[PDB]
Design a protein around this ligand. Structure first.
Ligand SMILES: O=c1ccn([C@@H]2O[C@H](COP(=O)(O)O)[C@@H](O)[C@H]2O)c(=O)[nH]1
Ligand SMILES: O=c1ccn([C@@H]2O[C@H](COP(=O)(O)O)[C@@H](O)[C@H]2O)c(=O)[nH]1
Ligand SMILES: [Mg+2]
Ligand SMILES: [Mg+2]
Lengths: 194, 194
């Protein structure tokens, strides 16, 4: 009865691409890097691995480091939009995020980040999972183009959230984008309501 | 097409009740405690709060402490059963667990625990969520009697896993139990297959 919306964290709420580039450049000032305009494909590490030998492992070391997730800046409009979305009648919002393989800091810092920006009561809305297809909802707003897993027919419509790495991608009809949080996300939600 | 089974962690895989009692008694040897045979109701803290003033907060302090989740012993047969279950043809297993409010240690230690007992490749199968009703599957094996959330009609059948706190409960037909991991869990799975 309530519309359920899954909102991805990295690349949708949290500025993973920007934070990564900044910290990569600072730690490795003598290595080549990929400017955001030149990013292509979900996997940062893979593009860096193509750019130079040993660069994938260096890239990985940035997001495995303590404070990487906690110190990510919110994307413009993301906190305000999600707060408003959650407050709408007949609308349930969950933050759905996939932790990295190295688990020392990432889960903890993602909870801390959500507490920081959305408050203690929002922690109840976090779902941490590597497989988003087993989470049921009406909508999933997520910057990754290919979302697959154990469920071959997920219940959600995946709305692609624009990011540097996907901005040039042609989608198969009838796949839809949310171009930024300034774009009209209420229209997208409303299209799914009775 | 593959049968999907959600297996709860505390009280099903990990011996939360036993670990809690042991550590409570050791930390607070002068306080009254609740023997496992006398446990009633999901909420440990609530029963302790009825037992004596200030005991709820003392109980909470045990599972908020570092190493509490990591040091939980597996329940008898749980690791062997879940390993076997995951290896079955046409069967996908996810571990579905609700972290406590205090997030400093709990998420991290639950990942570490799953790595310890099931190996690195099993980390992909963990779902951390306060709301299990938004995770879709054929079966949920979980020791908590009342499993509710944002989805009024979850896709799973909830099979109640016996625990000290629920062993006396009469369920509404046609709700079903798994009495322990020595009980015939394959029959329960098979009952859900085409
Ligand atoms: O090349 C990459 C790019 C992203 N990620 C990880 O993928 C997950 C996606 O996070 P979210 O967008 O689901 O929040 C993050 O934990 C991020 O660190 C990688 O492991 N490798
Ligand atoms: O009185 C209680 C009893 C259990 N729990 C918590 O409920 C969650 C259930 O874990 P799981 O059975 O979903 O793995 C655990 O994080 C456990 O610490 C409480 O907060 N209070
Ligand atoms: Mg993302
Ligand atoms: Mg449990």
């Amino acid at each position: 009865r309530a519309l359920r919306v899954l909102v991805n964290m990295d690349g949708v709420l949290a500025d993973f691409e920007g934070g990564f580039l900044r910290k990569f450049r600072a730690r490795f000032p003598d290595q080549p890097f990929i400017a955001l305009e030149d990013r292509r494909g979900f996997w940062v590490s893979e593009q860096y691995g193509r750019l130079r030998p040993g660069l994938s492992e260096k890239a990985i070391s940035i997001w495995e480091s303590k404070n990487f997730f906690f110190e990510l800046e919110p994307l413009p409009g993301a906190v305000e939009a999600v707060k408003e979305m959650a407050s709408l009648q007949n609308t349930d919002v969950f933050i759905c995020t996939s932790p990295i393989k190295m688990f020392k800091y990432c889960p903890y810092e993602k909870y801390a980040w959500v507490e920081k920006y959305f408050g203690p009561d929002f922690l109840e809305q976090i779902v941490l999972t590597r497989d988003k297809t087993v989470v049921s909802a009406d909508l999933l707003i997520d910057d990754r183009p290919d979302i697959t897993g154990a469920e071959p027919t997920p219940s959600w419509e995946h709305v692609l959230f624009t990011a540097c790495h996907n901005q040039h991608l042609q989608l198969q009809p009838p796949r839809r984008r949310l171009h930024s949080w300034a774009d009209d996300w209420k229209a997208i939600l409303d299209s799914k309501r009775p």
